[PDB]
From a paper:
Here, we have used x-ray crystallography to determine the structure of a complex between CTX and the paddle chimera, a mutant of the Kv1.2 K+ channel from rat brain, with particular focus on the influence of toxin on the selectivity filter structure and distribution of ions in the pore. Charybdotoxin (CTX), a pore-blocking toxin for K+ channels, is a 37-residue peptide isolated from the venom of the scorpion Leiurus quinquestriatus. The architecture of the paddle chimera channel typifies the family of eukaryotic Kv channels such as Shaker, with four pore domains together forming the ion-conduction pathway through the membrane and four voltage sensor domains surrounding the pore. Scorpion toxins have evolved to fit like a lock and key into the pore entryway of potassium channels, and disrupt ion conduction through presentation of a lysine amino group that competes with potassium in the selectivity filter.
The highest resolution data were obtained from the complex of paddle chimera with the selenomethionine derivative of CTX. We used this dataset to solve the structure of the toxin complex of paddle chimera to 2.5 Å resolution. Superposition of the channel in the toxin complex onto the channel in the toxin-free structure shows that the channel undergoes no discernible structural changes; RMSD 0.33 Å, residues 321–414, main chain atoms, molecule A; RMSD 0.16 Å, residues 321–414, main chain atoms, molecule B. This is consistent with the idea that the toxin fits into the mouth of the channel in a lock and key manner. The oblate-shaped toxin binds asymmetrically to the mouth of the pore domain of the channel such that the wider end is closer to the symmetry axis of the channel than the tapered end. The helical part of the toxin molecule faces away from the channel and the edge of the toxin formed by the residues 25–29 on a β-strand faces toward the channel. In the structure of the paddle chimera, as well as other high-resolution K+ channel structures, the selectivity filter contains four distinct ion-binding sites or positions, S1 through S4, S1 being the most extracellular. In the toxin-channel complex, only sites S2 through S4 have discernible electron density. The top ion-binding site appears empty. The toxin binds at the mouth of the pore positioned in such a manner to project the side chain of Lys27 straight into the pore, allowing the amino group to approach the top of site S1.
Author numbering:
A (entry chain A), C (entry chain A): 36 to 361
B (entry chain B), D (entry chain B): 32 to 153
Write the structure that this text describes.
């Protein structure tokens, strides 16, 4: 029922739903459509938009920035987040070294035509960089006014705790959020490992791919629709998943979940997204959308959230049969 | 190998997480039980308790079971600390034995009304 | 007798009387009148002027800045303070998160046409933001040269002490002042809770509404005068107070205080303001004024201060019968 | 739950404010009495005193009244510390009793000039 939530225990307030730019912005959809998606989201109270230096080789950030500049929205009314790790072909243009974090964020900010982002994320862990260097670099870009906060993505809870202890050890700034994958077929980390970090050090979760790239929408019940992400040039890997043996198994279970959706009076996508928000540990869910129809439907997940009773949740667990052991 | 800092009324103790994970059913060995004492600002668990006693409590985990009461700590105070940290009845029993105790016997008249009643005045 | 005082135990020297801009600047009075009030105050040795992002939706800061720029007064001869908390309708435009403190202060500075303020205040406590984040943000804007010092407003002494301990814990900068409400009918906090903080950690008090918005001036002895704050569109709440049962009771007691004023040879407003300055714990009192007459009279409170003997103070306590228990 | 740091000649002690607020009439329990020892630069109360003794002094508040002299601390030094921290005569009396003391009797000749004078040489 609470549309806005604190990101973890920080003072940053984000809408429980945010809009991402992977695959779509500067790639699958036209800039016109991108402007339409963002306007729709903004007008509906969504204040969180996520992008990354790697998405469409930087074009996603350029498109996101062109819209913000064009619409003239007050910067203080937005929460822009961007991820750093893969910034180029050169050896030194990737990773979480002090060199790439500073250069990477500076370049993203340039493409975004913004003085700063609200949260900068390490797109993934870096085995080749000592934690101290990474935490000092993130702390540095925050002190330089290049970012307000920083977070991790795809880090184990052990690594997140390391960054936190390193921050305390050197009087640096701890990360406030982890961007983890989360949907009905990927529940481990968010349900078993992250809650403890949330209560212990206040790190919140900002989940992605709530529909598993569209797989949980039910649109693949019988084949690969034309124009779906699974048909795009370059996403053969996704197509392989859907048609795989395990792929067929998921689609089968989705047909079982459909009855739950009808009982709750909503569409499957709305149920899948609302499911992700059922536990406090999740601060926000980043949505993906290739058109306005999808976004308008998905935003409706907020009306379903209140109906997710213990009974209903237990039922979905039975159908999925993949509830993780605590 | 992650390290844990336990602050006993200002006295700083430090150990490895694996050392505590050795005895899960104790307060310090169970994440859910010690969670209450964590200070996220200083990254340490804080206990407003008796200082002289904790040395032995920590050594218990490091030694793998050795629970020796420090010469300078009253038996009544140390026993309370053993119970607070939830070291368990086995350790407690092992402890009282060494401290020179243990022993509890004597059934009781079953035939209530009659036996048990007579066996009390005899 | 000491016109200038240290703000708390810091090295910042402020006049015992300052001029505020709530309700008046950019609102009730013309910019011409505002320039007149400020010139009068400045020429009389007052060096402290208080404003806030929330006053008249930012217009107060714009008016204050236009005067300073126009008069050409040396920046080093002024002590400009501004408050942050309510900066807009958007979810992220309010509170004491790192995001709003930085954006809020940056925007105020822009409206003030100043590189920095001398003291920035958290306009009120924020339950949704960890103390650490707030203290780190205030410390940050000070290190960026955006402010010289920071202070709290409407915080309990427990919260002020928390900010101080958090500052010591992380090598940050502690707050140096609390902006508390204080007048003959609101004595609790300033007299019972703040003195300890003053002696223990050097936090001083900068009090506001010394005349309780005009109520203690005696101008409402018999009805709501035309053009008084209580008659302004939007201050019905103030009008309700004055006419309330407790309102009548206050006005009755003011008629008793009038005799004290005559004995001391001053007007009621002068007595009310001088009363606020009777204890060392109060560094300065922020005055309000809708015209030059009011300001010229109020400034005269400094001549009354020396006459406030223990006997007289005891007498006022009897009439008010609200002296707080220590 | 606010925490208090007491520094005894370099030895760092830490407790909760509610623990000290338990005994208001003592030096550490009364804000006005400890104010004198506060160091605003380090946010701690500093006492240039005997180290071994404070452990027991702090335990007194934590235990709720248990005032035991540490085995390694001379009775004359510990008693001075009990008086300095103003723990009170009740605690002091309870203390000397345990330490094996207590006892004060013997009136005195009232009929001055006569009785009291004779009762002194007899
Ligand atoms: N931290 C990381 O490393 C990381 C990794 C990946 C993503 N992310 C973030 O998370 C965001 C969301 O991820 P995602 O794009 O995978 O999200 P998703 O919700 O799993 O999938 C969204 C996609 O599914 C389809 N879809 C959405 N709603 C639909 C509906 N109602 N009916 C039918 N199809 C629908 C659309 O694709 P088609 O219409 O083309 O089929 C859309 O592009 C990203 O944009 C990015 O910001 C972060
Ligand atoms: N920290 C916070 O949250 C906070 C909150 C409120 C205010 N403040 C600060 O404190 C400042 C002072 O507050 P305030 O305006 O309430 O002050 P005040 O001294 O209580 O009231 C001043 C108002 O009373 C009337 N007045 C003043 N002198 C008078 C006189 N001699 N005769 C008759 N009427 C007289 C005027 O209103 P009319 O002429 O219109 O009747 C004037 O606008 C503000 O401007 C602001 O800078 C801070």
């Amino acid at each position: 029922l609470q549309f806005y939530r604190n990101l973890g225990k920080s003072g940053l307030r984000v809408s429980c739903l945010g809009l991402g730019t992977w695959v779509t912005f500067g790639g699958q959809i036209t800039d016109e459509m991108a402007e339409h998606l963002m306007t729709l989201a903004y007008d509906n109270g969504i204040n969180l938009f996520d992008t990354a230096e790697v998405y469409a080789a930087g074009k996603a950030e350029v498109v996101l920035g062109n819209i913000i500049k064009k619409k003239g929205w007050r910067r203080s009314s937005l929460v822009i987040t961007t991820k750093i790790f893969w910034g180029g072909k050169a050896e030194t243009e990737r990773g979480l070294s002090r060199k790439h974090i500073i250069e990477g964020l500076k370049a993203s900010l340039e493409r975004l035509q913004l003085e700063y982002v609200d949260v900068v994320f390490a797109n993934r862990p870096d085995p080749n960089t000592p934690m101290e260097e990474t935490v000092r670099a993130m702390t540095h870009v925050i002190n330089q006014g290049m970012a307000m906060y920083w977070g991790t993505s795809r880090w184990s809870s052990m690594e997140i705790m390391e960054a936190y202890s390193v921050a305390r050890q050197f009087n640096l700034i701890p990360p406030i959020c982890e961007q983890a994958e989360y949907h009905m077929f990927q529940r481990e980390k968010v349900e078993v490992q992250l809650p403890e970090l949330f209560h212990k050090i206040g790190v919140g979760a900002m989940t992605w791919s709530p529909l598993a790239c569209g797989i949980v929408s039910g649109k693949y019940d019988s084949g690969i629709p034309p124009y779906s992400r699974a048909s795009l040039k370059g996403y053969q890997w996704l197509k392989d998943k859907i048609l795989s043996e395990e792929g067929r198994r998921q689609q089968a279970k989705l047909k079982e979940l459909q009855a739950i959706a009808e009982r709750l009076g909503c569409t499957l996508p709305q149920l899948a997204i609302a499911w992700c928000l059922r536990n406090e540990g999740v601060s926000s869910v980043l949505l993906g959308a290739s058109n306005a129809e999808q976004l308008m439907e998905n935003i409706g997940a907020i009306q379903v959230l209140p109906k997710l009773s213990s009974s209903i949740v237990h039922e979905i667990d039975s159908i999925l049969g993949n509830k993780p052991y605590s | 190998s992650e390290r844990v800092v336990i602050n006993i009324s200002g006295l700083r103790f430090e150990t490895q997480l694996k050392t505590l994970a050795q005895f899960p059913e104790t307060l310090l060995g169970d994440p859910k039980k010690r969670m209450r004492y964590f200070d996220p600002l200083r990254n340490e668990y804080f206990f407003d308790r008796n200082r002289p006693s904790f040395d032995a409590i920590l050594y218990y985990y490091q030694s793998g079971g050795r629970l020796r009461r420090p010469v300078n700590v009253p038996l009544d105070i140390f026993s309370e600390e053993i119970r607070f940290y939830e070291l368990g009845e086995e350790a407690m029993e092992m402890f009282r034995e060494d401290e020179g105790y243990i022993k509890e016997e004597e059934r009781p008249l079953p035939e209530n009304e009659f036996q048990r009643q007579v066996w009390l005045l005899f």
